RNA sequence: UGGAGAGUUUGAUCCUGGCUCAGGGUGAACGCUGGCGGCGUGCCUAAGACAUGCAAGUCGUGCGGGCCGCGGGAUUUUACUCCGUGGUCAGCGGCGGACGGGUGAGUAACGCGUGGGUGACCUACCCGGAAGAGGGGGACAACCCGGGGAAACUCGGGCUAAUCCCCCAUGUGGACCCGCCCCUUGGGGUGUGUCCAAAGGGCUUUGCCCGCUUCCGGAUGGGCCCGCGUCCCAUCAGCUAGUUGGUGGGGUAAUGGCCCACCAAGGCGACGACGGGUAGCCGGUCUGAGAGGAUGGCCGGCCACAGGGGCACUGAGACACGGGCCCCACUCCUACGGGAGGCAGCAGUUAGGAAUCUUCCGCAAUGGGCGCAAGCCUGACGGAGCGACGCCGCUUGGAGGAAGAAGCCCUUCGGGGUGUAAACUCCUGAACCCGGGACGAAACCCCCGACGAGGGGACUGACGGUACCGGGGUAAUAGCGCCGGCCAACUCCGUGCCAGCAGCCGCGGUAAUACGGAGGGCGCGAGCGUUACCCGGAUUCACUGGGCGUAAAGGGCGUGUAGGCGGCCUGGGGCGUCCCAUGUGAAAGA
């Protein structure tokens, strides 16, 4: 089956395309603890219809670009600027991590 | 190939008469009668409290030296018995006891395991008709361990088959004396042999 | 030190030659067709395009261009001709297109 | 072309073949698509030949030429025998 | 069915903590030693360089020739020419040369592994099905004649056949534009319009066979995409202009910045981007009680590479180890202009190296390629040869034989040891000689039948005159390590912090079980030791399974960012988690 992932839109600063952050949690191979891990996927959006903070399903597809390989299947819920914000700080945090 | 050298000589050293020389090691000397002690310049010298290693060693030497088999061959047999289903020490005595070169001797076709080996190499013995010349052969139960028809004539086969005219034979074996052939009925139980050797020290010898 | 199936090199050169040739004419023909169509042309435009068509299929018979590499070229050409044609007037000499 | 044919197992002076289907281009003792029997040319066992014949028919049915000796043995257990 | 610990810091103790040993293992090498056979396995280094021979062909049932022969014909004249046949050579045309074989350089990546997608695709030969093969035309080698080159070869001119090439037709069908219908990414179906087929050969010759063309399918092989998994350094922290996305093109079997034009300003990174080091990955192998650690030789799977670096052509497939082109390095031929070449195929030579084999027999078996077949080719393979390199089997005798020979060692001078060990008595008979002697091989093929099914028949063994059987028949090899403790085994001489030993603690300064020799003893035995490397013991990186007042170890203190963690009750969801079915988990291995 074509994999369906669900995440959040964290960028629509691109034409016909959205960055969709997707989290995932599991047992750790050796140390037990359930850990989280996450991944942005560039998902195709032909009708620039989805936007910032939409939670959306995502589907395996015939390649649209170098690194577009998923399509926005449906909207799950709107809003979620918390998750977006949560992301966006982690990004701006990296600014005072340098030398 | 196998030991070869002075023998009723650990009818000494291991402290107990091993039956190795057959008819003499029965009759005022497995030298154990004349000299019940270790060989060499220090033989009758004040004994030394020996190590739980020295103890365990000796015991496995003893067992191995009885049947005349080598450490390489012995050690494998044992290994085979640990991985085998059932209490391990007995099993090993079992497999040890199922060797042609020894069943032949248990049936009295020869007087010595050393002598009984030579009969197997040299052809004079069969397993259900067919001739078999490997002393290491695993006699299973139901086999018939015969003399060679062409070898019945021999002075030594006759003299030895003769002294068995009266004699009794092991509970797991039988023996038609005048047809010069016998039978491995089953594999013996620890109880069936009276071996001068505590087997659990052998297991323990090989656990380090 | 003399392997007589260097015969395969001789042959290849011949097919290369035969192949190159049919190809060259499919272009200089297709080019010529789309051109006349960016100019509003009944007969003359499709007539050529329909020569061009044939030639393609012809080349598909052999090892030249085989398959649907074929089809592709037919599609691209006979899309284009038609587009350009309504991008001005005339629709006529039926020729190749299902009007 | 796909084949029914003999793969050498066993050991030296102990040939033992496995009657296998495989792509013709694979090496002889390489990866086969399906075991369908075995064969001991010295007949040192009462059961020196054996063939899953419903399966043999299957492949034959989808086009698979047997070696010539693959087909001899196939015959012995009447793969081709009718009615 | 599974888990042992010991020595060593002190005058003594407890604890911490490192070192060290006992076990298994190896593609090993090295020393002393060395009898027989079976099955395995043998360049780990320079992906350095290679002489010579073999390692990829085959088809005359696709076609026309050259050269050396034989036979028959036209004429009754021997010039000239028609037909048939055998050699032998290449050519044109087809199929194979993309498989089989080698190697691990590169590669930290969709390369591998695993599970999935392909409505985004291709697949020669094989199998099933539907429908075809009617006309015409052309050329280039061979061959012949020129010219250039020293050689490799090369340029021109003329003739010709075909399953070589083109045109036209027939359109079962299939391709594409457009429209409509179903389905839902480019999948089916459908209507007009356009476009596209073919090859002949053999006969046991009107009836078969080997082929040809178009289509749908099957089978087998593969391409591309995705999720998750895949070493070390943060003393590498910021990286990115085809860069991220768009529209439209090209390109491909096919998706996609794969490539291109134009627009937008984007993408990635502490969940470690970028950079540096190292490495082919897996099935599995070894070790371990297990968790885990280490490893990827041989055998099997996937990858990559074919002196180094680019590129494409042909083709179902290649960007091709024994095909092509250019650049670089290197070797050889050279008439100095130019050429030729590529063992990481099998053998074998050299070089580096502690170290790694025969320039062997056979296509008899299995497998592969072409052929209708007979057959031809196959260093794939099946065997033999050399290495105790590994595993297993077996020999160097068996039973008698003294209160006990000799010699050699001890000695409190009585004796004790080697020791039933030899001597010698009977017995058996490894080696060796004679006789016989395999399985592995029944197909293809031919004959009956019908080219089927089934029946019958013949040919064929490299290993090999080997294995195995029978007959005869000789007492016929033993070495290496160790004996202070750990660790099994002690005495005499020699030697005097010397000579030397030593894994660790430590032995030697005139009485040394520790050095060297003796006798004797212990352990293994065609082996035994040594060095290296791996897991172990090491709960000494501690998930299982550790710690931090004084032993190594709490940040100098706050504030708080991300992150980790989160009270009592109820309800919804069912991501975590649990259960049942089912698919996958190749074979080999265990
Ligand atoms: Mg001290
Ligand atoms: Mg790197
Ligand atoms: Mg020493
Ligand atoms: Mg550990
Ligand atoms: Mg403090
Ligand atoms: Mg705080």
From Swiss-Prot, chain A:
Q: What is this protein called?
A: Small ribosomal subunit protein uS17
GO cellular component, as recorded: cytosolic small ribosomal subunit
Q: Which UniProt keywords apply?
A: Ribonucleoprotein, Ribosomal protein, RNA-binding, rRNA-binding
Q: Which gene encodes it?
A: rpsQ
Question: What do we know about how this protein assembles, alone or with others?
Answer: Part of the 30S ribosomal subunit. Contacts protein S12.
Q: Which InterPro entries match?
A: NA-bd_OB-fold, Ribosomal_uS17, Ribosomal_uS17_bact/chlr, Ribosomal_uS17_CS
The beginning of the lineage is:
Bacteria, Thermotogati, Deinococcota, Deinococci, Thermales
Gene Ontology MF term list: rRNA binding; structural constituent of ribosome
The highest taxon in the source lineage is: Bacteria
Q: Name one Pfam family in it.
A: Ribosomal_S17
GO BP term, example: translation
What's this protein's family per the entry? Belongs to the universal ribosomal protein uS17 family.
Functional summary from the UniProt entry = One of the primary rRNA binding proteins, it binds directly to 16S rRNA where it helps nucleate assembly of the platform and body of the 30S subunit by bringing together and stabilizing interactions between several different RNA helices. The combined cluster of proteins S8, S12 and S17 appears to hold together the shoulder and platform of the 30S subunit.
Question: Knockout: what is the outcome?
Answer: Increased generation time and a temperature-sensitive phenotype.
Curated annotation (Swiss-Prot), chain B:
Disulfide bonding pattern of the chain: none
Classification via InterPro entries:
Ribosomal_uS4, Ribosomal_uS4_bac-type, Ribosomal_uS4_CS, Ribosomal_uS4_N, S4_RNA-bd, S4_RNA-bd_sf
Q: Which GO terms describe its cellular component?
A: small ribosomal subunit
Record keyword Metal-binding present? yes
Its domain of life reads Bacteria
Give every S4 RNA-binding domain span. Answer: 98-160
Q: Which Gene3D superfamilies match?
A: Ribosomal Protein S4 Delta 41, Chain A, domain 1 (1.10.1050.10), RNA-binding S4 domain (3.10.290.10)
User: What does the Swiss-Prot or TrEMBL cofactor note state?
Assistant: Binds 1 zinc ion per subunit. In a number of structures (e.g. 4Y4O, 5FDV) a 4Fe-4S cluster is seen in place of the zinc cofactor.
Q: Which Pfam families match?
A: Ribosomal_S4 (PF00163), S4 (PF01479)
Q: What GO terms in the biological process aspect are recorded for it? A: ribosomal small subunit biogenesis; translation
Q: Name any cofactors this protein relies on.
A: Zn(2+); [4Fe-4S] cluster
* Function description: One of the primary rRNA binding proteins, it binds directly to 16S rRNA where it helps nucleate assembly of the body and platform of the 30S subunit. Binds mRNA in the 70S ribosome, positioning it for translation.
Q: Quaternary structure per UniProt? A: Part of the 30S ribosomal subunit. Contacts protein S5. The interaction surface between S4 and S5 is involved in control of translational fidelity.
Q: What is this protein called?
A: Small ribosomal subunit protein uS4
Query: What organism is recorded for this protein?
Result: Thermus thermophilus (strain ATCC 27634 / DSM 579 / HB8)
Lineage of producing organism: Bacteria, Thermotogati, Deinococcota, Deinococci, Thermales
The gene behind this protein is: rpsD
Curated annotation (Swiss-Prot), chain C:
Domain of life, per UniProt, equals Bacteria
* GO BP: any one term: translation
Entry keyword set:
Ribonucleoprotein, Ribosomal protein, RNA-binding, rRNA-binding
Q: Which Gene3D superfamilies match?
A: Ribosomal protein S20 (1.20.58.110)
Molecular function, one GO term? structural constituent of ribosome
Q: Which family does it belong to?
A: Belongs to the bacterial ribosomal protein bS20 family.
The record, for NCBIfam families, names: S20 (TIGR00029)
Query: Oligomeric state and partners?
Result: Part of the 30S ribosomal subunit.
Q: This protein is called what? A: Small ribosomal subunit protein bS20
Swiss-Prot record, chain D:
This protein's UniProt keywords = Ribonucleoprotein, Ribosomal protein
Coiled coil (residue ranges): none
- Which Gene Ontology MF annotations are present? structural constituent of ribosome
Q: Please, one GO biological process term?
A: translation
Quote the Pfam families the UniProt record gives.
Ribosomal_S16 (PF00886)
For the keyword Ribonucleoprotein, the answer is: yes
Superkingdom of this protein's organism: Bacteria
Quote a single Gene Ontology cellular component term.
Answer: cytoplasm
Family annotation (InterPro entries): Ribosomal_bS16, Ribosomal_bS16_dom_sf
HAMAP family under this entry? Ribosomal_bS16
Its assembly, as annotated, is:
Part of the 30S ribosomal subunit.
NCBIfam families (UniProt xref):
S16
Quote the PANTHER family the UniProt record gives: 30S RIBOSOMAL PROTEIN S16, SMALL RIBOSOMAL SUBUNIT PROTEIN BS16M
Question: What protein family does this chain belong to?
Answer: Belongs to the bacterial ribosomal protein bS16 family.
**Known role:** Binds to the lower part of the body of the 30S subunit, where it stabilizes two of its domains.
This protein is called Small ribosomal subunit protein bS16
| Annotated source species | Thermus thermophilus (strain ATCC 27634 / DSM 579 / HB8)
The record's gene field reads: rpsP
């Amino acid at each position: 089956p074509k994999k369906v992932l669900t995440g959040v839109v964290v960028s629509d600063k691109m034409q016909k395309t959205v960055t969709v952050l997707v989290e995932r949690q599991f047992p750790h191979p050796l140390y037990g603890k359930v850990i989280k891990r996450s991944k942005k996927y560039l998902a195709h959006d032909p009708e620039e219809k989805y936007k910032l903070g939409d939670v959306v399903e995502i589907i395996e597809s015939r390649p649209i670009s170098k690194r577009k390989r998923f399509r926005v299947l449906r909207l799950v819920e709107s809003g979620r600027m918390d998750l977006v914000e949560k992301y966006l700080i982690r990004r701006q945090n990296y600014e005072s991590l340098s030398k | 190939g196998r030991y070869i050298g002075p023998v009723c000589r650990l009818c000494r050293r291991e402290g107990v008469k091993l039956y190795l020389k057959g008819e003499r090691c029965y009759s005022p000397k497995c030298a154990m009668e004349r000299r019940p002690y270790p060989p060499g310049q220090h033989g009758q010298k004040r004994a030394r409290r020996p190590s739980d290693y020295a103890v365990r060693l000796r015991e496995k030497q003893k067992l191995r030296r009885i049947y005349g088999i080598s450490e390489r061959q012995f050690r494998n047999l044992f290994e085979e018995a640990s991985k085998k289903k059932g209490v391990t020490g007995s099993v090993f005595l079992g497999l040890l006891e199922s060797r042609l070169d020894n069943v032949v001797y248990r049936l009295g076709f020869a007087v010595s395991r050393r002598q009984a080996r030579q009969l197997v190499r040299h052809g004079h013995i069969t397993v259900n008709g067919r001739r078999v010349d490997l002393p290491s052969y695993r006699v299973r139960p139901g086999d018939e361990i015969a003399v060679a028809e062409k070898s019945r004539n021999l002075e030594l086969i006759r003299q030895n088959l003769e002294a068995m005219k009266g004699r009794k034979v092991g509970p797991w074996l039988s023996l038609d004396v005048e047809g010069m052939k016998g039978k491995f009925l089953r594999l013996p139980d620890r109880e069936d042999l009276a071996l001068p050797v505590n087997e659990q020290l052998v297991i323990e010898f090989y656990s380090r | 030190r003399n392997l007589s199936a260097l015969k395969r090199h001789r042959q290849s050169l011949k097919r290369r030659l035969r192949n190159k040739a049919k190809k060259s004419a499919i272009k200089t023909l297709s080019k010529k067709a789309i051109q006349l169509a960016q100019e509003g042309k009944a007969e003359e435009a499709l007539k050529i395009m329909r020569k061009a068509e044939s030639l393609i299929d012809k080349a598909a018979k052999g090892s030249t261009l085989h398959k649907n590499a074929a089809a592709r070229r037919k599609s691209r050409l006979m899309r284009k001709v038609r587009q350009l044609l309504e991008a001005a007037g005339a629709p006529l000499i039926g020729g190749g297109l299902s009007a | 072309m796909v084949k029914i044919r003999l793969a050498r197992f066993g050991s030296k002076h102990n040939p033992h073949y496995r009657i296998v289907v495989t792509d013709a281009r694979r090496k002889r003792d390489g990866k086969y698509i399906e075991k369908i029997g075995y064969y001991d040319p010295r007949k040192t066992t009462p059961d020196w030949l054996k063939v899953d014949v419903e399966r043999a028919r299957y492949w034959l049915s989808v086009g698979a030429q047997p070696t010539d000796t693959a087909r001899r043995l196939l015959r012995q257990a009447g793969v081709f025998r009718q009615e």
